Amino acid sequence: ISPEQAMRERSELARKGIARAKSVVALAYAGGVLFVAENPSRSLQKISELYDRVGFAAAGKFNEFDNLRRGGIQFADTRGYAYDRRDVTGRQLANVYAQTLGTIFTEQAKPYEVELCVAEVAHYGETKRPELYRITYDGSIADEPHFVVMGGTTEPIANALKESYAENASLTDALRIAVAALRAGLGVASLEVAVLDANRPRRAFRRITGSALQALL
Amino acid sequence: SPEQAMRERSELARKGIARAKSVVALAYAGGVLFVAENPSRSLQKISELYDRVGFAAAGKFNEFDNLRRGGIQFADTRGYAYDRRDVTGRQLANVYAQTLGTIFTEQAKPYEVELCVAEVAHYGETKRPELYRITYDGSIADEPHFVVMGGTTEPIANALKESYAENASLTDALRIAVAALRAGTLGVASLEVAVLDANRPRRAFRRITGSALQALL
Amino acid sequence: ISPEQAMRERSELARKGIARAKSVVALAYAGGVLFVAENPSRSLQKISELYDRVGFAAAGKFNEFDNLRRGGIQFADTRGYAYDRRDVTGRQLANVYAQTLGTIFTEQAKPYEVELCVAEVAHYGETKRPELYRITYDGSIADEPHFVVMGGTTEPIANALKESYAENASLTDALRIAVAALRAGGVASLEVAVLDANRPRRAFRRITGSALQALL
Amino acid sequence: ISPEQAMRERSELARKGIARAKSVVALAYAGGVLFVAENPSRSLQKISELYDRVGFAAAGKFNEFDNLRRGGIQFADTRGYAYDRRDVTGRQLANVYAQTLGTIFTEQAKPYEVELCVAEVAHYGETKRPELYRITYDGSIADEPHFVVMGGTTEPIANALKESYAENASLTDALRIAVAALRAGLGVASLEVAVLDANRPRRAFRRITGSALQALL
Amino acid sequence: PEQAMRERSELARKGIARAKSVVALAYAGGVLFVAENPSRSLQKISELYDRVGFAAAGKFNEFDNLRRGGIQFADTRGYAYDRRDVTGRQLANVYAQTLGTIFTEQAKPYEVELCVAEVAHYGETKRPELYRITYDGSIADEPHFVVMGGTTEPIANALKESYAENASLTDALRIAVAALRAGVASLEVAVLDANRPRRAFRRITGSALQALL
Amino acid sequence: XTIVALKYPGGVVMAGDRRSTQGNMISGRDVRKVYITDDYTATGIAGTAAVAVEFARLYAVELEHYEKLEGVPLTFAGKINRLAIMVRGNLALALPLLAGYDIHASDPQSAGRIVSFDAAGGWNIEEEGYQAVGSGSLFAKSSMKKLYSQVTDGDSGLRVAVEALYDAADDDSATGGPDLVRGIFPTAVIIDADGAVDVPESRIAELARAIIESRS
Amino acid sequence: XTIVALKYPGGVVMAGDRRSTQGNMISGRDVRKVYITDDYTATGIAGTAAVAVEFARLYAVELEHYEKLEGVPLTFAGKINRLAIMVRGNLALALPLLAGYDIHASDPQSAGRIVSFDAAGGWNIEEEGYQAVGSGSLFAKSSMKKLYSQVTDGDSGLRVAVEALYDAADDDSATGGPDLVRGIFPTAVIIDADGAVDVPESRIAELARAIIESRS
Amino acid sequence: XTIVALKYPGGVVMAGDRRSTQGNMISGRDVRKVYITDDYTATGIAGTAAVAVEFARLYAVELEHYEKLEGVPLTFAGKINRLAIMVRGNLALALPLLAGYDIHASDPQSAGRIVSFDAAGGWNIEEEGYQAVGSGSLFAKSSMKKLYSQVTDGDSGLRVAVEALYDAADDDSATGGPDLVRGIFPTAVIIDADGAVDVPESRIAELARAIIESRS
Amino acid sequence: XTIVALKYPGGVVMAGDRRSTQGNMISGRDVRKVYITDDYTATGIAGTAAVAVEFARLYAVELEHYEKLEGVPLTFAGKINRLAIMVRGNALPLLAGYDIHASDPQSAGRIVSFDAAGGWNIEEEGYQAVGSGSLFAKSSMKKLYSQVTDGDSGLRVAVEALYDAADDDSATGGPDLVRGIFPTAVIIDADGAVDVPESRIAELARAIIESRS
């Protein structure tokens, strides 16, 4: 059974499922990382905390990425308990996601129709540039320095960001640049917003909802 | 067809390696030098394995990192059960050959990787550095001077066949390697460099980063 | 799925891989058995000791025959420990390799691209003619009385030996007849070793460096 | 392909491998059963003792029939120990081989390229006619009363025995009648000879080699 | 999926058609088994349990394996419950499950056709039972006779006319020998004798067999 | 309780008492301890009704199982072997006594066989003519010792066996004597070339009543 | 009980008594404790009839099993190794005494072998000429110490073995002496270059009679 | 045996005696019990040479294993965690004393760390300045209690550690004093911002001689 | 029983007595307890003939197994590690060896012992002994060790230490002049491990005895 053939059809099945789903954007700003996703749902989340300085964002089939979300928290909590809280990093989680997705694609019947983003900010009182990793349906991992765009039609959103992005932008500015890029290919009702706030003492993940979000939007 | 499946699997792998960035490993006066085109701060293609043994790879990260970890586990287990001297480059190269060979023949997809295992002499001993490269199919080759992996290898290999000098200094060997790479800007920001320094008493692996790497450039 | 077809394609895949690899020659001489292989490598060995009077030589894909070399050593040590050192024979090891290769040829996705030679000389102070076995990729075992040729293009090397072979050739003579015979298909390119019947227990002896030049 | 076919492809695969191999003859004489085989080898045996009054002979691929020889000895020794030595019989062993070959022919990828003969003589001081069984590659068992011919080109050798077979013929006579037939379709250097001697108290199998065989030829 | 079943069934029918024939019939004193068998040691008819018998046609190695399996089953059941638990239905049922599983899970289906027969216990009056179990696990309850192996139709038709219920031993044997053709060195014969105290299975061989022919 | 077995010219006889106790209390007066296991063997266990019957049933099943599977009975050695395997497997308790007649032995007169089992589950072919197991075994053996010379056939053999059981009861409160009031007597099996047969109660009653009148 | 073994020039002899006891009670007068296990070996166990025969049977099966599988018997060292593995496997009790003849030894006159097993299951090749196991072993060894100088061949060796068993019975109530009333004598096996043979009972009877007449 | 550890401004020092005893008998005089485990840690075990070195070796392998896998060393808290896991895994014996320097702590003068383990396998970060384990630990701690005020740097810290071990040996026969006849002295490790280094035997010998001179 | 080992310039020597006892009874007079395990090592166990030979055989197989698999022998530290693994997995051996890879050849001799808990110990005091006569042997070597200047004087001290062990411990066997049985010994230097001839041990033993009378 042709390996070429199998591998191309599986890639297509996955790419199409991701292209059919809503879009997510993750970008580096002054106070950390900002996650913005098109999400009409009030209960089915696409963005989540993983560990203290590490966040998660995904696009694709919910049941598939939530399984991964849950699994990542599982892996993170076990590692931090068996070693120290500082062992848990984005690189480690991205890596773990890469092995998991790679195995699914290689081994399961249908590949996961997901695209993941793992981000990490500095520990409190430290100066380290935010890290953003893109993990794709086949286990490919990419280290992006500025932004990550996942799901739907990525090209017009990616091109809109290359132009608008500017390093060390404030929260309000970064949000608008992100909401604008999502319109290239929407308010409180159709959005999910969260930040990995580097100024938080331990848990960097913070959700920006309701009246507080309208204020910055 | 058994004959056709093998050629396809070979092609799938060869294409994935050709698509990735390049790595060069070469013998010099003070040991072995590894130079890779690596923009990423946190994802590494070069690593320590054991006391005088080093690792370098090209291809799909998730796959070669999994092998890097397996090699470290193997080496640590061997050195503990026997003696630290049992761990050799030959041994590690052999283990990678068995592992890659098993993956290629028996998995639904071969690994899109090429690996180089290098070894220098123990402190105060005179032994010529050894360099082994293991391929996606489990083929192992003993190279006496240099190893080139990933991307378009031919122009980088030919550039070295010409510019390669035995017993070259650190500064000279680095430039000959960076040139060779450039053929296929390449500053500190885009380079991952390390040496297996034979003058180190136990652990030969040393990373050359930041301001210290600028000086030798 | 066609048994006749699958069996022919697997045979071809193996044959081609062996034909692509460097050549090895194993022959009987006065003091025992002599192994000579084309090997540019200083660390990746094609010839090896198995047990006290038993030797190993292979041609093909390294990772595959090294796995078999290790497996044969594991088998031999386990047998000799559970029975006596004399239970380990060339016949036994060749038989085990035949079962192993035969099973690989049937159950694994890809057959092993190897050809193996197991040789045995007499115990110290005994007179028994050297035994040489050829084990092929499919599990076929052949008892050869004079020489075994494996890997690459075997016919010109095999025919070169059929003519140049002397029953009780000396070490120096046997080596030249073997090196000459390879050329029909020096030190930095050769791996040489003997199963010396005059050694008290361990017959396997590697002939390297200055000592080998002296015989060439 | 189809199932009627598969079974045919296998018969041929098997029949061809047996036709390619050297020939073996097993015949009843006065003092028991006589086995004669074309065998240039001094160490790779085609004829063997199984149990006290039971013998084995085979033609085909060595690795395959030796595996069955070993399997038969294992079965016989286990049976004789769990019941009594008299439980082991030719017919019993000839049925075990039929079940084993039949299972190989059906459930394994490649049928065994073998043809087997199991012979049994009477216990000491008893009068029972020698029994000869032929077990073929597919698990077919045939009860032959006078002789069994296996391997190579069987038809011309069988006919030559018919012309020269005499019941109750002496050892010397039976040997010549057997050697002549093999020749039709050879000395101590190229022959394996053995008898199941009914006059032996317990172990009937006796090898006739060297000078003693010359003295009979 | 449909083709596979058809092909397999066809393969099975062929091997059975290539083999010698067996006949099992009800008579006055129990059940009678008659088979074409040149061999002196490879048996096609056997005892299973006290009142239960076994007869088969097809590939020897395959039906002997089933005979052995049936004896194992019967001996285990009788020990775990009582000797009366073992019946023809039970063994046929077990053979049906076994052949059915083989037909569905192995590469090649068994080239066999089996007959399990049962007579009454001593001093009881129950009509003999005869079961035909085929290669696919189909079980048929036959009231008078069962014909297996070879070319069954001419043997089955020859019995349909000449069949007398309550026939004696000598008469039943001749009607059976006369229907297979449609001697002692070309036959295997046995009865499930309902007049036997415990073990009903009795082989009729040699000089005793010539008499009744 | 007591089981005795003795060889006579032409065969063997095995007899057992009928009592079962729970401490000093009589819990059984009708226990049958000796059972025919095949056409040529019988077993006896100096234990409860259930142990004696259950063992015999499992053993008889095993012997007939072999006969149906293989077409022929096990040889006597094979029967003892299967029994030993069964006894050693139950010690993973009272020990069985086997009485048999080897139909393939060359001398039919001495073809009778007695096999006992020791505390560790080891078998023992008896060569002295008789044996006994159970709490009254020594009294039975010492009685047979003095009476054995009177054994010339099946009947004088049976008589000696009944008298040994009577002596066991006379000295061991755990072995039951002949009960004239209830008409309960020891059971017995006699095996010769024609096979194993249960001795009729009326022959035992007659022997027991005569031993009684004679000692009165 | 007592089993003795002694090396004579060109051979080895092993002898065992015939008694079995249960406390102070004589339970056997005919126990056979010494058995030929292969053409060149014999085992003796100072235990019950069952332990002696069962151990010997399993050992004999294992030796012949190897011979049929491999085409040649195990070397003597391999025979000891299989016996040791069997002994250690039964421990994890009475220990065997192995007597043998190494057909492959250089000097045939001293090719006789005696191997014993200690409480922990360890083997020891006896180098002093004789050994004994069992409850009368010390008495037998101390007797052989004084009589061994007379062992110049197989016959004198058989005579001394019998006299050592006689001395063991004379001082240890658990060892049986020659029984002239019943005609029961120690059993023995002699092994030399022509193989292991059972010594005829008539030969042991005359030796026992001469020993008795001499001490009278 | 006794191991002591103390914090000085800028680092930590750990020292151990050299004796080993099998009851009242001196079985060792050169036992090394303190080993550097990574660039900033050292472990000491008040046990045999093998327990001390085997533990240190396994712990050092684990720390370096993490560094190679993740690219950075574990934090100090993670090093203790891995040590605790290893200790609890061995208890389901003598307990580890860990000395270290946290290179990530804000105040370098107090970055030295001492961690002990109780009988149940529980870790304890010592905040009183020093700790000791072993049979002479109470004598060593009571000596350090009176001398600790003298610790102003690395040298005086080392002197106090050697004098604590001297006091342990003076009151506990299982702890070894400085042996002037053989030139054997306590071993010691010193860890500061530049890493862990073995203290030269010559420096310990001078401090030991000054302590001996002072007590005289 | 007693085994002794001592370092001499450029070498090491190991010797062992020949007795075995069962309580107070002498069960053996020719027990060999010291065996060469590879070209540069020997092991000695103060136990029965079987324990000493079986342990040595398994250890010898393990050292040669590694050499054939990896092409080179284990380093000395690796040989000790495999021995320790073997001892912990399982009365306590004494290992004597020569490190062909050490810097100074005169001092390359090695002695490794094991304590009750299975812990290894490299001995740096010059000698060591194990067994029931070990304290007597060590106290004897303590006074005689300054006389060791070479291979031969080492062997004499080793034999005299064993003599002293037997003189004070009834479980260790002294030289038996009646039977001609003497302690066995192995000597190891740069040229490898060799069994010391019985004739040389016998001579040293006679001179020790002559000197004491």
Curated annotation (Swiss-Prot), chain C:
Its main location: cytoplasm. In the course of search for new antibiotics, a class of oxathiazol-2-one compounds has been identified that selectively inhibits the M.tuberculosis proteasome over the human proteasome and that kills non-replicating M.tuberculosis. It holds the Pfam family Proteasome. The formation of the proteasomal ATPase ARC-20S proteasome complex, likely via the docking of the C-termini of ARC into the intersubunit pockets in the alpha-rings, may trigger opening of the gate for substrate entry. Interconversion between the open-gate and close-gate conformations leads to a dynamic regulation of the 20S proteasome proteolysis activity. In vitro, chymotryptic and tryptic activities of the proteasome are both completely inhibited by epoxomicin and by the peptidyl boronate inhibitor MLN-273. Also inhibited by Mg(2+), Ca(2+) and SDS. Disruption phenotype: Cells lacking the core proteasome prcBA subunits exhibit reduced growth and persistence in mice. They are also attenuated in interferon-gamma-deficient mice. They also display increased sensitivity to reactive nitrogen intermediates (RNI) and increased resistance to oxidative stress. The keyword Acetylation applies. It is found in: Cytoplasm. GO terms for biological process: modification-dependent protein catabolic process; proteasomal protein catabolic process; proteasome-mediated ubiquitin-dependent protein catabolic process; proteolysis involved in protein catabolic process; symbiont-mediated perturbation of host defenses. The keyword Endoplasmic reticulum does not apply. It comes from the Bacteria. The modification Phosphothreonine is found at residues 78, 172. Keywords: Acetylation, Cytoplasm, Phosphoprotein, Proteasome, Virulence. GO terms for molecular function: threonine-type endopeptidase activity. One of its GO terms (cellular component) is plasma membrane. Pathway: Protein degradation; proteasomal Pup-dependent pathway. Gene3D superfamilies: Glutamine Phosphoribosylpyrophosphate, subunit 1, domain 1. Was identified as a high-confidence drug target. Belongs to the peptidase T1A family. The 20S proteasome core is composed of 14 alpha and 14 beta subunits that assemble into four stacked heptameric rings, resulting in a barrel-shaped structure. The two inner rings, each composed of seven catalytic beta subunits, are sandwiched by two outer rings, each composed of seven alpha subunits. The catalytic chamber with the active sites is on the inside of the barrel. Has a gated structure, the ends of the cylinder being occluded by the N-termini of the alpha-subunits. Is capped by the proteasome-associated ATPase, ARC (Mpa). PANTHER family: PROTEASOME SUBUNIT ALPHA/BETA. This is Proteasome subunit alpha. The gene is prcA.
UniProtKB/Swiss-Prot annotation, chains F, G, H:
It catalyses: Cleavage of peptide bonds with very broad specificity. GO terms for biological process: modification-dependent protein catabolic process; proteasomal protein catabolic process. Pathway: Protein degradation; proteasomal Pup-dependent pathway. The formation of the proteasomal ATPase ARC-20S proteasome complex, likely via the docking of the C-termini of ARC into the intersubunit pockets in the alpha-rings, may trigger opening of the gate for substrate entry. Interconversion between the open-gate and close-gate conformations leads to a dynamic regulation of the 20S proteasome proteolysis activity. Belongs to the peptidase T1B family. The 20S proteasome core is composed of 14 alpha and 14 beta subunits that assemble into four stacked heptameric rings, resulting in a barrel-shaped structure. The two inner rings, each composed of seven catalytic beta subunits, are sandwiched by two outer rings, each composed of seven alpha subunits. The catalytic chamber with the active sites is on the inside of the barrel. Has a gated structure, the ends of the cylinder being occluded by the N-termini of the alpha-subunits. Is capped by the proteasome-associated ATPase, ARC. This is Proteasome subunit beta.
